[PDB]
Amino acid sequence: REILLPEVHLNSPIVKHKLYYYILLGNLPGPLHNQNWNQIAHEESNLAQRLVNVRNFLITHIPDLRKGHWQEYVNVILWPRILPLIPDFKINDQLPLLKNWDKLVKESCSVINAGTSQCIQNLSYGLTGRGNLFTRDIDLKTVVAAWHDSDWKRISDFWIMIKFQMRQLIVRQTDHLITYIENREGIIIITPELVALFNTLTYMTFEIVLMVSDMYEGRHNILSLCTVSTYLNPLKKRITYLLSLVDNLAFQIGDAVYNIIALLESFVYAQLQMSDPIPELRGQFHAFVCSEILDALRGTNSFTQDELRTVTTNLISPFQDLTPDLTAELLCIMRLWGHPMLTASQAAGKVRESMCAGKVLDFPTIMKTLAFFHTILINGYRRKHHGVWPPLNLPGNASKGLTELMNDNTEISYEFTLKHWKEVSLIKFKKCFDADAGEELSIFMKDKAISAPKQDWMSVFRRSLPNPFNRRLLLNFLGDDKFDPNVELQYVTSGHDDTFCASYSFAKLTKRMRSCQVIAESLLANHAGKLMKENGVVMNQLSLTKSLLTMSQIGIISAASFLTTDLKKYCLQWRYQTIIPFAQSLNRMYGYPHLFEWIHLRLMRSTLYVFNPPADTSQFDLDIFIVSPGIEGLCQKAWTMISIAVIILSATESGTRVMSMVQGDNQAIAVTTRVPRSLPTLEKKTIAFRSCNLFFERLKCNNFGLGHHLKEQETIISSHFFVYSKRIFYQGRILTQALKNASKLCLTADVLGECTQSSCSNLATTVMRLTENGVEKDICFYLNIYMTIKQLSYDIIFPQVSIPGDQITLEYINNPHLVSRLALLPSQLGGLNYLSCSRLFNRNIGDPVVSAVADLKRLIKSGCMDYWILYNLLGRKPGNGSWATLAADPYSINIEYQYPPTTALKRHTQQALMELSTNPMLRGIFSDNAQAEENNLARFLLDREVIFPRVAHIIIEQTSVGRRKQIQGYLDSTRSIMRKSLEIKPLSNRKLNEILDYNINYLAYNLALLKNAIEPPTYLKAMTLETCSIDIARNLRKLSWAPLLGGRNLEGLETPDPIEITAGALIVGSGYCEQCFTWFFLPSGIEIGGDPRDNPPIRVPYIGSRTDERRYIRGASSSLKAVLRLAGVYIWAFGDTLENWIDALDLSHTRVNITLEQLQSLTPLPTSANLTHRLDDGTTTLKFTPASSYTFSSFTHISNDEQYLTINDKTADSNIIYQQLMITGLGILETWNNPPINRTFEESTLHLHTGASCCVRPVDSCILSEALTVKPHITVPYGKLTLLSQFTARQIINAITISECMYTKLDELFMYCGWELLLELSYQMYYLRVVGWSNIVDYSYMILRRIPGAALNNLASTLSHPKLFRRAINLDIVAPLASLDYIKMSVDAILWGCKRVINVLSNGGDLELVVTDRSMNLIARKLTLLSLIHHNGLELPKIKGFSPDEKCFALTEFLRKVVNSGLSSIENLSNFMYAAFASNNYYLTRKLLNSIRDTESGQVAVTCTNDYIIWIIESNANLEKYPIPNSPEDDSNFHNFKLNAPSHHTLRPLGLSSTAWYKGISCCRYLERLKLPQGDHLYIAEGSGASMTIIEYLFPGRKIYYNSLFSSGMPTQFIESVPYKLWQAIGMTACVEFIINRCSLVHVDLESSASLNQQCLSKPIINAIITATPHGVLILKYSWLPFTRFSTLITFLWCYFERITVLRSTYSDPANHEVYLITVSQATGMAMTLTDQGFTLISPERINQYWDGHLKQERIVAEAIDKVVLGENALFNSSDNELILEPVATFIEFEQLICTMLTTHLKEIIDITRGLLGKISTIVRLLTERILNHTIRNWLILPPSLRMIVKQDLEFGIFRITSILNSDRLIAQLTAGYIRKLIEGLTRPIQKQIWKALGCVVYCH
Amino acid sequence: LKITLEQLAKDCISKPKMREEYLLKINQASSEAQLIDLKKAIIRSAI
């Protein structure tokens, strides 16, 4: 009662000892002990008394008390299952509680039914419209009616009731009877340790009833969920058949059933691998497992042939005619029969069968794998060290290894090291290498199992004829004195004693050996564990999932054969004399002798034991007993390294392109070939099969040599059948491993800190894994609703601390609307619902509060009987709160009940522990007044002008008190250890009551959220009409946190919500949506299970993108890194004041007490970190497996080809929302193709518009000065500047093994790019035959033409459509002369670069090699001079030698040789031999760049009707030509193909918005080139006050026709010009029908994204019929960015009208132009095009004219833009335009005027410093905008160099200040001392506007 | 291993007479090479 209720789900095994002990303590009608009973009876139990009462009850109560032979009266504890299933207590009158439960839940559902359906339907419309389809109806009410008012539930309910009764009885027992339920048809007896059942009688101990209750509730959950239409009748029928049959059999036999169930586990894979393509694997594993089942069945005497045959047939029957995923689910539920009961004897006997069995080892094999361990270690250490290898690595024969050593080759090929023995002998007895010990204070703060001393039995159990220990490693260590992590190790490795007896359960042993064990494992996994090869497990999650899916893919192309080895006994098979090679090697590698093996040694002279049959046995005894054999789970890291070694060896012993993954003992291998690419799949799979068979035979042979009885029980092979950690991978996708997690849908969470809240939490997360794979999302939403409802009911009726007094439970159980309005609001903002909507499509978070109000607005505006609760949330009484509470977590709304008790319990436990300390000065690590200082520092950091909780948390984390709290937080929280802590009773009495009544007070609070409170007037309007969540979230957070800080209102956070912002629309076939920018593609692809060659694309796997934007006398990392990050954040990268830096230094000086005091006036290297979002913490623990699902986010083809951000380094300010948007699109698409599907659905796209944003909220940046001068207190033990070009080339080509900072450049960039590439490759030359010029160019190009990814990034993010490509094609760096291409250019550049260097290499050893320890620069010089001799040599051979000076001597000799044969000036030969140094690339590069920020002319060194037509074809022009559709976008290169180049807009010279009429005059020119008959002039859907007018001005017709898409509300400019001259004298058929009911030309224009068929065919139909109502020619705007569609569109047009001629523009910037184009029936011609999709084109060569004309136009428009940014004109056509159709003057002192504006704005700024809106962002942005307009107006006053500067800046580099330093001309200086930074301070539409304005001005004068 | 071939052949062929004859050959043969050959032949006979 007082604390710590017992558990609810067992984490302890079930034995056969203790249950028998109970049931034979009394007379309840073989065993492993036959000793005595009355001894136990009077042996002080009182359970004898209780069970005497039980037997009295039973005997006197039943009639069959004394009869013949029990034939009426049978007790079957032999696992009755059909009996628990049978009506043991099925009498229909349930306890009135459960009926109330049903009433409440059902009523809540009937209430909230209609609303949630509308919520989901409106969610569907909002995203695309009517999702969640099947190829029938669902509803919440249908969910509950088919989930809970269907059969197979009453049993679960019954056992839940029994479980609760037993729990409460155990509680009462702890407080210090039984319950007797007499009734018709049964009798119930419940004891605190045993329960009885009868109606045919049985007994159940505590753990047993728990197991069976869990089993039943899980089974009910599974079958019930399968009743939902998602994964329907197949699995339902199969699971029910299998359940009935296997339960029957379990009764029929006994424990043996479990074995076949064990075999049934692995059985699925067999049934699953019957892949008809590749044979012999089916008949391998299927047959093996079926025969093994036959054996493990017959072994226990069932029947001979008929029963065996038929029962095996029936156990196989539930697997036929299924798909793989269903089988996987059926597996994960096939484990559903309760963990069997144990018996000590059998387990001890098996592990004895693993005792001595033979010293059969193959010395050659163990030596070979030793050599490979050596080479792996050496290669790895050389890799990361990036210097030399170990101090001594060459003891032995062969000067070739000695060459490898003295030369320091970073590589030792496996092929090589196979050819030798003892590749090194790192074995001595002197010293230590490359490591040290005594660190990582974490481990000892964690406790593991620990056994008793020598005298064990009397301590381990009762029933003797004696002393107990009951100790704990954690208590002992925390209460240990003079502990030294070092001296313990030498005490261990020294003289052993007989005080060590390890026990078996898990395994445990004495304190000192377990301590040294964990120490050694920490050392290994800390230093040596890092060196990993052949396995992708470096990073936590992304690397794992990515590597896995890439393996399963690289199996296939548009060569797959895996096999996997899995079991645990593998670990307990090794022996000493096959480990001491590696043990000794590693031991000597880390110094101290004979350490890494000692376990075996002890196990030599020791015995073990897993309750004991006593005759006489108390000491060393031979044999339920183990005598000195491996081990269950200790030290297994060495096992991992050795498995790595052996897999490498067996691989390289044959031609094996091997790839590996391994966790614990379960591992999976893929092997690959070089199969010829024309043979059918069968042949390729056959070659792969032969290869993996060779590898597998060799692997088995080598393992047996090493000794491993590896069998077919553990090794399964196939072509496409990966497995890893219970997650299977099949033909490039993760299988839907859902239903097992479905079986985790419990009723109450872990008991430690149990509370309603936490319970629902698990629910959500559990349902969340269910959301991830398989089942449709809506079902998951509904299921979460149902589960929270049911669980809230279960907790509100019969609580575990039930109180009859209060009325809160009364008002809850009385109305159902209340529980609904508590289970339908985001739990972060109060309530029991954890992320219904948003998390449904993303694992990320953003801000919970904005997502919470997104949920709330969605529900309300959809209708869930909620409107007034919002205002109540607003005017909610703000909770107590504190500086520190806000501190330790941001995103935090101050509410009373948001910390579950388990947190407070953890805190109290850890603090009580830290109260125990007799250690070294770690005592100071705990002080009582800590939390006061914590809140004090939170105040100091947070009671200022502008305060940010994110930086608050980061600083408080990295500071002095931070790591202190961290240490005191990294303790265990196990029930045992927290119970032991609570055995220190004095926590308090108050908090005791608090935790004792938690859920009650929580429900009382939320009940106080009854019908609305009073709505204050301000907020009433302030929040009404749900405009946008973010402002609501801002106001809510402000109002809530108010009572502490008040006036200040924190911001600087709250990125938006995905579903709130994004609107999007799906498209299939011909779809028209919201008028216009990301998009996802999905071609007509057949799902998994078809044909590898017919998968339309090359299957490319995308991953939830999680990037890490990571770009000196001592440099080794320590707490010094912590202070680095501290200062970097605390300075904000803008706030640089003496106060601020003094304070940062001070917080440092208090933090680092690691070395001596740190007094540096300015920590030099701390770099800027607030310019970015590089602020977070994580990545510490071992694993996190449950990745995700992918079955159609595989053929996905994303592309960011539309503008979202420009040339910039947003650095996770937008990548976060970008990451969310990508994952959200993927989830939308998958959900749209979730269930079993085909290619039946056709090519489909998804276009997400980001335009609909009710608020966007542009970012801001400013400063403040904090001052409250309080501090924590502690002292414990812890000229020309092409250098930018040089560094840029260095970093870039360094990355290949993002155009900012490459914008101010020269061709020297690619010069040095080529230089670095040539340098590296030249060292790789090693004088292989390459003559100077041509062969070096060829080999360079060949080594370049590979590894695309990095080249992709470079191309996209630098060679983009802005001036960079313009400059490039102007300098002839590239060459564009069918190539509709963008990528090849990239590599050409590099090649060109290299080639250019050759020319300088022709004469001159200049270019001053640069490097970013002196041996490094020496070998760099060596590499360079090697390159030089390789080029300009070509007269004599040369030899390799040493690195330091040998090649230098060879160079001097070869120079003296070439003294008589050269090209250069001959003296410079000596000067040929005649090196710059840096610190780190990124810092120096960005610092030097920001040092170029002085007004400079480095840009100087960088310094109408001429379009035409491509007259495609004529009448009957049939001559289909070859498609050559080679196209861009191989992989998703970054967002630059046509995004931004607005400077073109000056060539449409008027000041209006339409500006399209320029195109009008062009097309009218081309029209006048042609004759055209009487006019009707139809302009379909366009003309919006735009072009059309000019046409009549040049071509009048009769009876004009106008259309546009009708919106909420007419052509403007048309009326604005002509009608005076006039008066002088989304839908398919309705709109086109209005047109047909209402000759000459028509005008049409739109655009959408990729869909390989047309969707506006109605308009060609329009033209056909309108000219029918002649040769009236069309005008049709289009573009071949997706040239396929363009060719398809021209072929479709070619239907009727011949002589089609397209004409290009002259105003669109360098970009794929927006060119203007001029059978039997419509659908049949469309079909002609459809079947002409593949090979049908009429543009085989005209592409030549198009593209040379495009480059012409590009040059012309660039020249023209520079002409009009100057004084010249493009007239004789602007006047034709004007016919039809800030004002400030200019002075030289406009710069003085700008100074005036600056001074006035700064005065406003300093003045203001001294729903709502912004503060300094608004005024500063308006200042800059005003300055911009003023400059564009005063343009004509000009120091022209400055005009060129700002020309570039507006051309991407927007608005660097001109008059920087002259802001000098005192108070306006000191009041804001950051004037420089402020002066050092971009939206597309604004850019188009300013370009048009500049053009208007330059035309005006 | 018997029912292995049985389930496989049932999963492969459709003709009644051929199904019957094949199952007959399966349920009586006792030379393992003949079982492997049955597997190969029947899995080849699916066109």
Ligand SMILES: [Zn+2]
């Ligand atoms: Zn759109």
Ligand SMILES: [Zn+2]
């Ligand atoms: Zn908004």
